[PDB]
Amino acid sequence: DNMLLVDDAINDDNSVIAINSNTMDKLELFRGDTVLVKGKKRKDTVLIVLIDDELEDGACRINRVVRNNLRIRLGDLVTIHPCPDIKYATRISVLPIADTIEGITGNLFDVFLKPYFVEAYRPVRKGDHFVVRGGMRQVEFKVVDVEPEEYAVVAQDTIIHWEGEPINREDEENNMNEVGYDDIGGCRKQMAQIREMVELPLRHPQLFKAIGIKPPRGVLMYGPPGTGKTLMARAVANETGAFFF
Amino acid sequence: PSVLGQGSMSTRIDYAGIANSSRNKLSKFMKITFDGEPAKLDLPEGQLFFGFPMVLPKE
Numbered sequence: 667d668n669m670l671l672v673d674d675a676i677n678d679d680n681s682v683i684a685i686n687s688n689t690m691d692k693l694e695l696f697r698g699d700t701v702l703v704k705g706k707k708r709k710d711t712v713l714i715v716l717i718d719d720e721l722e723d724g725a726c727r728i729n730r731v732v733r734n735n736l737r738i739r740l741g742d743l744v745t746i747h748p749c750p751d752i753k754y755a756t757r758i759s760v761l762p763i764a765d766t767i768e769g770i771t772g773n774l775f776d777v778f779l780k781p782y783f784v785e786a787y788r789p790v791r792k793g794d795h796f797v798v799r800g801g802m803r804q805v806e807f808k809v810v811d812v813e814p815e816e817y818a819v820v821a822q823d824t825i826i827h828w829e830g831e832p833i834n835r836e837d838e839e840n841n842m843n844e845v846g847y848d849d850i851g852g853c854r855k856q857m858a859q860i861r862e863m864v865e866l867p868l869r870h871p872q873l874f875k876a877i878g879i880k881p882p883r884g885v886l887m888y889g890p891p892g893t894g895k896t897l898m899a900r901a902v903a904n905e906t907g908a909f910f911f
Numbered sequence: 912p913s914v915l916g917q918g919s920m921s922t923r924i925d926y927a928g929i930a931n932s933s934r935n936k937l938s939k940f941m942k943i944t945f946d947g948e949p950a951k952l953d954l955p956e957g958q959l960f961f962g963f964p965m966v967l968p969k970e
């Protein structure tokens with residue numbers, strides 16, 4: 667029972683997901699428990715479980731920040747599992763987003779993060795983002811590094827490092843290619859042919875062991891220039907999740 | 912003696928410190944050897960350093 671509906675979270679916590687009481691009973695959880703949620707492609711995080719009666723069966727509440735992190739919109743579907751092994755991050759380094767430090771002065775740490783980390787125990791994972799409302803503005807921060815890795819909890823014993831250059835929001839997508847199947851159209855048979863020969867030997871290598879064959883290695887795509895061959899290969903590689911060179 | 916890497920002008924300038932920092936050269940929130948890469952060791956005009964850990968011949 668790990669497939670649930672997505673709903674907007676009225677609360678203003680970047681690491682809180684609400685579940686129905688019946689849903690909580692089915693998954694055998696408790697109020698405040700931290701659980702791991704995996705969305706589209708290979709993006710996943712951990713959120714604090716909350717009990718909310720108004721939530722319908724098989725539904726969950728996540729804010730826009732969580733939706734951006736998980737690459738999903740309202741009403742999408744994710745996979746949720748218990749995360750009882752989560753430890754407390756002993757040392758975390760995080761830096762603000764450049765566009766979020768426009769004109770903001772002073773000790774940004776004390777102003778924004780310290781109220782945000784006063785015994786909050788907010789789950790954190792590598793590459794995550796979280797927004798904090800300080801004063802009359804809002805500042806976003808990113809999980810640059812954590813110890814122990816990967817997913818942990820920020821507690822009082824944790825050492826917070828806010829030293830480093832601002833994180834420009836542009837290069838997260840302009841300089842990085844994170845394109846899934848949603849960015850390909852007009853070629854589905856070709857995508858099926860590529861996937862059934864790329865993902866299957868890698869995602870499920872035990873099948874070919876079971877049937878005692880050596881799956882084909884090479885693949886040669888070709889066509890008129892500008893038909894998206896590079897884009898198709900990039901999308902397949904990103905969806906597979908294997909080290910892409 | 913101590914002149915084999917750990918003496919005067921090797922503690923004024925953390926030569927071992929430079930080598931170790933080059934080893935663990937990352938943001939990230941003793942022994943000196945030549946297993947790695949060089950790191951810029953800059954000294955002002957008029958200073959000569961002879962304290963590099965010796966190497967001796969092929970024997």
Ligand SMILES: Nc1ncnc2c1ncn2[C@@H]1O[C@H](COP(=O)(O)OP(=O)(O)OP(=O)(O)O)[C@@H](O)[C@H]1O
Pocket residue numbers: 849850851852853890891892893894895896897898
């Ligand atoms: N389904 C699609 N098919 C083709 N092109 C697409 C598709 N979706 C988007 N595009 C756009 O079409 C252009 C394809 O450029 P791309 O570099 O992939 O072409 P190419 O001929 O395979 O390249 P090359 O051989 O130089 O690597 C890009 O702008 C890509 O954004």
